[PDB]
């Protein structure tokens, strides 16, 4: 076995060993041993394996906590354990092996490996730990030293796993272990059960397994090696990407390997001695020995001389003895004895013994070739032939604050051609294997006079040898290289670009002398070796930080004492290059601070300057001849076309190297994005003075928090914004377009690098554009349906008509019509709403423009629906539209199309839909018309005396009068406001009817002998008096609405000079009189019913209804009357005389004229003001529970105030309940809490449905609602899993609903014109359990830096209980424990991510809870003045830093785990196969997560409903009805969501709609994203959707408009049964309408 020829046949047992396909184990299976294992987190990159893969307690990093590789000159050569008795050293053992990081394999005693895969994972973990301990600990030359040491440890591991160990130690403990696991493996496989030769076939089968997994183990063990290591001396890199085990060292004999090891270790250390005896060589005695001065400076020379002598003597003895031990077996190889016999194997030791001992005295060419042997001499005889300029600072990059030019200055210090992109460089100019073809080495770099050098010391042809001994000589070599290169470059180019390219070349040197060259060539990776071993001699003596304290003063790690050397002395390099290319004079001390930028980024900026210069040259002519296009500029546009479209043809740009610009940009984007993602997950960031320190990772992490993902954005930031293009096309605006492939309609999105420059797309081939497309590209309104005598079908989109026959009955294309119409009719209706809410004038023109589109579409649909009915005449678009608009409601709340007990919603529907009971389609025409009309005196003695009205008292008598208050009269009464709905306001009750009514003994209508005129005049006078009284009542602050906080009830004054809320009071009083005049739901005074009767009589006698018209006419009269009132009052007022422009020039609008609605609004404002007053009083009385006895309840002051609040809220509970249910019934869809919140900003902190909570626990555990917080002084503490007491009933939110649907509501209105929509809240997220947060948050408003404690506690509590309840909702609601556990784990992870986004404030919902929660988080973390982005950063990293060794999003995850454990224990099951991971990754953007969840649940429901319907089909009416009722509303979901995706994909934190950082999503379309996302299993982590043969994933969009094949088989039956159901349900609805009409 020469190890070169015999082995290739003795090897090759990994291809003809079909067991290998099952013996090729691999990690990346389901969670490993429930100890943090994972599948994808390793298949993506096997390198990033952690200890948490088998048990991490037994399998921790090797627990031999004996100093590794940093020890004395220990060499087990003497009597140590058994070697030394008769055989002094059985085998040449270095300390390296004794530190072989296999103590992970001492504590492996366990059996459930259940695959070769887990055992592979264990051994690979050991290999990776060994590789790390090697690389971080190897103070040496050190390139060859570290590389050889790594491969030698790999070969030692090979022997160990193969069992061919020769060192004796604690191996049997793991030896019989690996025996038993291998036995387990061979009993797992039937094919390998063909191999049971005793003993368990250790040797042969372990060799087979080693040859099966050697590739993986070698690949991983070298992963922890920096790229600038040059591992393998075959491509002499990092040796990691060799794609095959490059070394054969694992195959050489173990004992031969170790004797070579040992001789080379002696060799390295003896060269160390021969050079370090020259430390004080100025006084080292190369002459007569002197020791008279008595110091350790001259006698040391002889000391080390004799030490080296004794070393060589002892090594001589041990060498010759080792020779004998491998030789004294001559006449006994082989007998079967174990006295002094060494037995190694049957294939590799035999040839060794017969060659090197029997017939040959010494060994052969191999060990002579690579490992040198006679540096001093060979003294072993198994091989013969013995030959016997600075020293200064580093920098940590203080970075600036985004001044649009991206130049980080400097930081702390220290004391002492043609852009070939081809592929990873094989044997010529290319890129390193990391950057196979991603950024594309520019042509100036190649041929830079240094990469054109095999060796630096070959500075010039004139010099023959090396002067590099002193620092100055090496620095001068660098200087002359720099000067010559500058000369060459100036020779090249001619100017201003000169300095730019000179800066780039300077950065190239600055990276080469730091060894991080992204590229490489035939003269690279060897000059790099020369640089390293040169630095080893001079400036190589300070590398002594492979230690435990590191002293932070020697800066010792080859790079640091190399890159630090570069940071210094680069002033001299740059000046010399300036003194090279003669552009020297102070033009461009000054240093080009660009070298700190990663070389990849500048290889981007270069080649972007190239593309820009070419493009601006090619467009400058274009922008001329297209001037509106004048006559003929299509030719030069076509030149630009072909330039930017060429697949590297002759006609086209240069630098693209073949593939067109689009593909190359895509590669660049992928590389940059994955760099961003790698930078996201790493624990290194900006430290000395709050600055990002170091190499690519930290710099990229600095870009994040500035955005600057999507290299387009980077470019837009760092470019000059004018280098390319007369058309200032920004690097945002991806500008979609399509082209042919160079199968014909392929599309692309290059941002300012698509054909047809920025605006001149229309202008090419002049065709002066019309108004429609100028709207279309703006994407203003986008009705994408394209209707253009059969049916003239209104096609939706690029989903072509596929008419199918399953069948005057319905037949073929016929059905499609209805269904298409069914969707169009639906969607357009829905569509109309948003654009109704929509409305410079450009969008107005767009709005008109799509209006006639819709009008014509409706015209054609109406036309051909008549044709449809005509075919089916042997159901009229007035029946059907009515039915469908009713169906919207009946499916929204009900599902259930039978129970019709509304009796109040009926009015709302008939106003909306069904006047005259399904007679007319006019709802649609009316909506269209509405879309059309949306194209955007008493200053006399006004003694208005009343004998029966005095100062207002309903809110208490005016000061100093105390008491006399009124309350809210309620369900139907007589004395005040006979009204079945909302309760009666006290202000209404004390209305001051004036002289309009009197008593005269008690009770009397005095308006009996009057007519219109004097009655109205008396009304006017009464209004005057009552508004004067109201104004006085509000000036004094007696009015509850008028009272402010602790201030004198007048601190808030409106910007009109009027008492607070007195505006609203006057408006409500006017509304009260208005609704009183005509018969409405008001009787608001003793017997006003007779007053409406009196009006009806006294008016409807002379006019001949007419009361209504007369009131409408005199409405302006009475409103100008109250205007004149306010004028005279404010001129009587001590302030300035205001005008009739008191709030409302016209009377209050008829919209907010529903007396119930106005009453409710007034009540809500009253309630908010009183709640705030009570809260103020509480915080006054609950800030010093003071002196509480257990349990520590409120002690009477806090207790009394808070109990007053409790009683108040107790009665307002039923009050608000009744009022809100009446309102919501009357105003279906809208919510009372909103109405209050926008109409009254006074209560934003108020949270109805919580202060008025209905759950009993949320009353008994919450005795004071929201104020069951700080009112209750108990200092709630979170309890972990183990705690004897639990969080039982602490936050017992009810069990989650299962079938509540997605909502577009509560989506935040984002900013100026951003306005995200088409995004809908996932069900589980909107029914999120977060209630316990709200109360203490109210307490948390005060007491910063102490509230965060409570926040952490409540987050843990709520996370735990939420996980418990969500698991309960998923898992025990089912028995398929595998997939149920997977789905529950996915839901829990999604919930955790949503909660984290809430903490980070990146959540998109702003419902009553989350809105206030986010506001309070901002006010808490943002102390007083921090910018919004800074507040986000603070509440983000506070979420990211630990309290005690564990970060917030680790404690929360633990709370989730403990909640799941409670759920499992209660259900009495096993812990899930998921949920056990102790380290989850980072979250995709919440929109992406919601999209994934939506697809998952949609495919689930589809596979359920369609299967049910197919199985069913007389009765399957219910089945396909369920299917189609779930489908259609779910269809508009997808359209809006896909539209939003297309708006936001590949955009980064400064160009996406939201500020949220996207662009980890590289997919042109959402369909392409999903089919490339979860086309597989549904495992607990990172694959959470799973869709299967939905049409037997573009059939996703195909089926939403139910047109695909898989449904066409049943479409005909389903449409007929649907139509019959429509007929019967229409009958029912008209019957119900007729029923209500009485």
Author numbering: 6 to 241, 258 to 409, 500 to 527, 556 to 633, 641 to 734, 748 to 786, 798 to 856, 873 to 928, ...
Tell me, in the authors' exact words, what the paper reports.
Parasite-infected red blood cells sequester in the placenta through interaction between parasite-expressed protein VAR2CSA and the glycosaminoglycan chondroitin sulfate A (CS) abundantly present in the intervillous space. Here, we report cryo-EM structures of the VAR2CSA ectodomain at up to 3.1 Å resolution revealing an overall V-shaped architecture and a complex domain organization. Compared to other PfEMP1s, the ~310 kDa VAR2CSA ectodomain is relatively conserved among parasites. It is composed of a short N-terminal segment and six Duffy Binding-Like (DBL) domains (DBL1-DBL6) unique to VAR2CSA. Several of the DBL domains are linked by complex inter-domain (ID1-3) regions with limited or no homology among PfEMP1s yielding a DBL1-ID1-DBL2-ID2-DBL3-DBL4-ID3-DBL5-ID4-DBL6 structure.
The extracellular region from the N-terminal methionine (M1) to amino acid F2649 representing the entire ectodomain of the FCR3 VAR2CSA variant was expressed in baculovirus transfected insect cells as a secreted monomeric protein and purified by immobilized nickel affinity chromatography. As the binding to CSPG in NaCl buffer showed a 1:2 stoichiometry compared to a 1:1 in KCl buffer, the less compact VAR2CSA could introduce more unspecific binding or the proposed additional minor groove binding site is more exposed in NaCl buffer allowing CSPG binding. Structural analysis was performed in KCl buffer, as the highest affinity toward CSPG was observed. Next, we determined the cryo-EM structure of the isolated VAR2CSA form generated from a map of overall 3.8 Å resolution. The final model represents the ectodomain of VAR2CSA, exhibiting a well-folded conformation with clearly defined DBL domains and in agreement with previously published structures of DBL3, DBL4 and DBL6. The region spanning ID1-DBL2-ID2-DBL3-DBL4-ID3 represents the core of the macromolecular structure, as highlighted by a compact structure with a high degree of inter-domain interactions. The structure discloses the fold of ID2, forming a separate domain consisting of a bundle of α-helices, a shape which together with ID3, a 30 residues long α-helix (residue 1955-1985), serves as a structural glue for the core. Notably, ID2 and ID3 interact, as the C-terminus of ID2 forms an open-mouth shape conformation, which interacts extensively with the ID3 α-helix. DBL1 exhibits only a few inter-domain interaction sites with DBL2 and DBL4, leaving a cleft in-between the core and DBL1. The similarity of the VAR2CSA FCR3 apo-structures by Ma et al., and the one presented here is high, with RMSD in the core region (AA residue 450–2022) of 1.38 Å.
